[PDB]
Amino acid sequence: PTVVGRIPVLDVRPVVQRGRRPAKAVTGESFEVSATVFREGHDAVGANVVLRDPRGRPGPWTPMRELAPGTDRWGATVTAGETGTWSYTVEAWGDPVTTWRHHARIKIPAGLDTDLVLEEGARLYERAAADVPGREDRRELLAAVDALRDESRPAASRLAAALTPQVDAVLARHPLRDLVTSSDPLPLLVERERALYGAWYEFFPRSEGTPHTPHGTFRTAARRLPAIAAMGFDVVYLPPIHPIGTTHRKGRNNTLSATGDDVGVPWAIGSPEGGHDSIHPALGTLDDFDHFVTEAGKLGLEIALDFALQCSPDHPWVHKHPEWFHHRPDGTIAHAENPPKKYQDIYPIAFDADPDGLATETVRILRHWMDHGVRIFRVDNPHTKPVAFWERVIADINGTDPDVIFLAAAFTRPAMMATLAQIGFQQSYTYFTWRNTKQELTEYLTELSGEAASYMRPNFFANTPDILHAYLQHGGRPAFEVRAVLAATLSPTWGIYSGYELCENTPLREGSEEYLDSEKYQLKPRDWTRAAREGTTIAPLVTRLNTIRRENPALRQLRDLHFHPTDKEEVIAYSKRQGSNTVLVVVNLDPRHTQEATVSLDMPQLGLDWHESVPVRDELTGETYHWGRANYVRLEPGRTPAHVCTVLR
Amino acid sequence: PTVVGRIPVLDVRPVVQRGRRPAKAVTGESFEVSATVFREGHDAVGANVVLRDPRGRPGPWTPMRELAPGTDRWGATVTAGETGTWSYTVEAWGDPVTTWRHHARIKIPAGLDTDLVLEEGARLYERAAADVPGREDRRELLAAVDALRDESRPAASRLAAALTPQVDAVLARHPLRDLVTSSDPLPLLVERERALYGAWYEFFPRSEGTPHTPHGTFRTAARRLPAIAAMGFDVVYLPPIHPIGTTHRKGRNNTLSATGDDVGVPWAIGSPEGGHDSIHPALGTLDDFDHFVTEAGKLGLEIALDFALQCSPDHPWVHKHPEWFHHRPDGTIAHAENPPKKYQDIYPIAFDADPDGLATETVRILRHWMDHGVRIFRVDNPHTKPVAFWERVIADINGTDPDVIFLAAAFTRPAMMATLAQIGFQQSYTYFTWRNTKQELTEYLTELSGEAASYMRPNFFANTPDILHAYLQHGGRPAFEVRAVLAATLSPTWGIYSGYELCENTPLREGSEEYLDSEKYQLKPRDWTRAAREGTTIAPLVTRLNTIRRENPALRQLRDLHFHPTDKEEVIAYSKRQGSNTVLVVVNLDPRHTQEATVSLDMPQLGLDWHESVPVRDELTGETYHWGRANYVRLEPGRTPAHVCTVLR
């Protein structure tokens, strides 16, 4: 056998790890399948995509087009359906009809071999008709055959009878394909909508207590859910909900010594009260948790638990499974680190003494929470545990429960971030919070919305308990407004950590990205009712952003994204599309000064001609404009962070 | 099993067609094997390349280094040896010693846990020693272990005993590798030197005749060989040597009707006198050819024959194998085309009726010429025959005779060009003749010397019977000189078509790349002796260029190539290296005006510091200069096309 087929079809994309890992999609998501297709000689080729479902049933006829002249790169859009493992194949073929037409169009006017040329056409169309399954379609082609063969008519009219729009349509639907040649199948993993699309809210249940019981329970913390659902969130992300160690417990503002009242850090998991399969006694019981999950469910909220594979020194594993830790010559275990950050309250896990035991126990723990309605896990710092460990774990869990979603909380180098997504992580944290200028946003989002989108789904948290960017520190509320608009409109998954709404932006010190009085080390009661009454929250903006997302399919996908040029460095503009839904966003990235600019839209990229005018509505205001080629905007911090417009149709 | 190993080693390169075709090299050629290598956590990794020969024997220890900070891309140079199919593997591992050293160097001076740190070192070095096969090497490591454990010495000196150059050398040669992880093997095809390196000369034997017999024979044309060898060429490329059809024979200057004297085009192969396995009667016999091949051999010249899989209408195949042609409804066979070029004197071959018969006959014909000492074929327009046909043919021929070299004469789109090389073509024609500005040469050669060098070996013909570039037409002799320097120094394979030496540059008409009175359609006798006497040939320059190439290993390879900036658009500068041989070239691409410039050398890329001065000799003149950071050149067309300097040691 030869590697190359009769009609070359090469380098089909997307491809992940040379075919050894699947490319990704979710139900209802469209993406481009592409290939290098060409043939020997000068005759024309055609190509098409055969997308097969998990039962092997092929999708509809999906012809490809050359993506740019002279490149031999061909593409077509496919749309994933039900969940499971799909496959895709590209078929390439000689297109004798396009070839014959091109030649006939020159030769008939120039009078060269006209009887021969026209009889050659007749024979192609006759072969075409043979394969057409409709009687009416077949009859149409055979009529053009007879007109092509009618030697009593002028050559120009015998030919014209074979170039009618009615024939065009039969051939476009059932074309004559020579020497059909197939690529080898490539795997596609299709997963549920929520893997790609959702709004996430993170908060600490323990902070939502009462005057008589400051440490919240699952029962008190459930009272906070209606407001989360009202802001249009879909996922609630909870930091670890397990007992918390006492040895080397950290105090307020990340101090080394806890006082007797100090609650400690939820990530310092485990005590004699229990480990990763237990509930912190001050949060209540497994039944209180079930209640919380149930109440979340009634409001359209799914729970994501933090899974942090690490231990306080009081975690049962320390004595029950010493081999799951790296011990130094004196028998002690070095606390975990992530330089320059030190984690004196925890031990990292070692994986090379008992990998089988760790995997078995990890999936046991996850299956336990899954039995209690948790179908999403936020995996803390997966880049400090082996890549293959996660590949094995995720494959074990998804093999019985493919709906489970894992989110990689890994802020690290690009190779590891990409690899984690490729080996199974449904979602990934990103460099979003460190992309704030227009150049940075434009470059980074072009990367995420391009080839990386075949294996990585990004979750744009505008802030996290560990990240209060200098942009929010110096920018105040107007910067909070900008970052929410950006996050919500540039990724189909975004989220915030409680307090973002209130523009909490006091750092631990200058040049730090830590919050002062960080919630990680203390109860942080917040007077939500007061903030709402006093209007010192951007909950309404957040609420509006999520409503717009729910009403505009373009914002529930990632790959279709285009940046339009403006004449001010502080003003960025982009559009996103999905069927007939087009959303156009203009943001002022200066949180401190009013900016005016001309936004010059790439009109063909919106499906419009250069001269056209198009009505839009700013969904932030209800205000309507008529925009085209070149549009004046004026964006005032405080009053207007951005325009978020839908194209009216 | 998991796709990813314990220590990630990903995307090993070179790779061709995702591993389904081999990457290429020749005996003695060095190239970079690279991979993405990293681990979980913050400890250091190492990596190395295991190159295995056709018998499976691994090459030497070949450690890799990270190629640029923060990228996790690692590389090392390997060198191919004997011919055949090799394999290469990248091994990645935890490097605990580098990790421990880095930490020990901070902790011992700062007094933190010193007994614990040093004992951890001792245990590593003990594990190191276990795997060392030399008694003397082992004894060295065990000494540093004992010095590390000696609690009566200061901490600084217990540590210093483990950082000696003598320990460094044992560990550099036999390091402690944790969790060794291997990539899957990738195939390497290693071929003979000539596939990559050689100077080629093309000429038409028939043009080298006598006053009494103007049509040359193999016996008269042999007289021309000593001069070809004297110019330092290694390969003689002959246009087709077979009988030439009479029906539709073309006349002079590509006219449609031959007169009775007209000789026709050698590519119009076949008559009643014979086909592709015959000799044109006016060239002599198979014995005369053997004589020519023998005489070429004695002079260090190998013969490359043109193989053009096409027929005159008088070729025997037309009646013996009608099914090897596509016939139209009236029984005629459309002449071959290559738009806008028409080939009225030939028929193209059709491959879908009897692919087996065509492959069987093609290898038969090639084996016939191979029996007569032809081990190189220049394959005419392979892009008009199926890609898989060549893949099969080349695999069949190289399976018995791996030394045979095929050269793809395909000026076409990039995809097909690359594919032809990937499926087996040892050498490729290129876009060289259409790259004449500095930007064009720089861009194109960066492409050829980079990733494409793992599957394509370029043959830089400065001209061909079909290509007289406008640059040569308008530039005159100075342009001929520039293009020879460029071709000879930028590719390890280059060539010229006879007449190039004489600066024949009269086009058929303005805006054509055809020669007037093209040798393809007529005998073209040339007064070589006169041109040599009158100094109106650049044969001496050519002769010098090939001597320089034979004396400078840097110019006998392709991948090591760097462009150095100059401050004039018309002056280009580059260097090439191979062991301690460094060649530095500066060319004035303006053939009409004198150009002066400052050449600012990237000194680290020469293995030198910025401040260093280095002696060079212009091998064109014998003249010696001292060059550094910044060097003044003055290049005068006619006198000086270029400097071609060697770095003096």
Ligand SMILES: *[C@@H]1O[C@H](CO)[C@@H](O[C@H]2O[C@H](CO)[C@@H](O)[C@H](O)[C@H]2O)[C@H](O)[C@H]1F
């Ligand atoms: C992911 O986990 C890290 C380390 O586990 C968390 O860091 C916090 O928790 C540790 C352990 O209790 C503290 O020592 C550290 O000071 C905290 O910031 C991150 O918050 C999680 F995202």
Ligand SMILES: *[C@@H]1O[C@H](CO)[C@@H](O[C@H]2O[C@H](CO)[C@@H](O)[C@H](O)[C@H]2O)[C@H](O)[C@H]1F
């Ligand atoms: C490769 O082959 C082509 C076409 O075979 C040659 O074109 C010449 O020969 C044909 C056939 O005799 C003529 O019709 C044409 O006018 C010629 O230029 C090229 O020279 C070869 F490189």
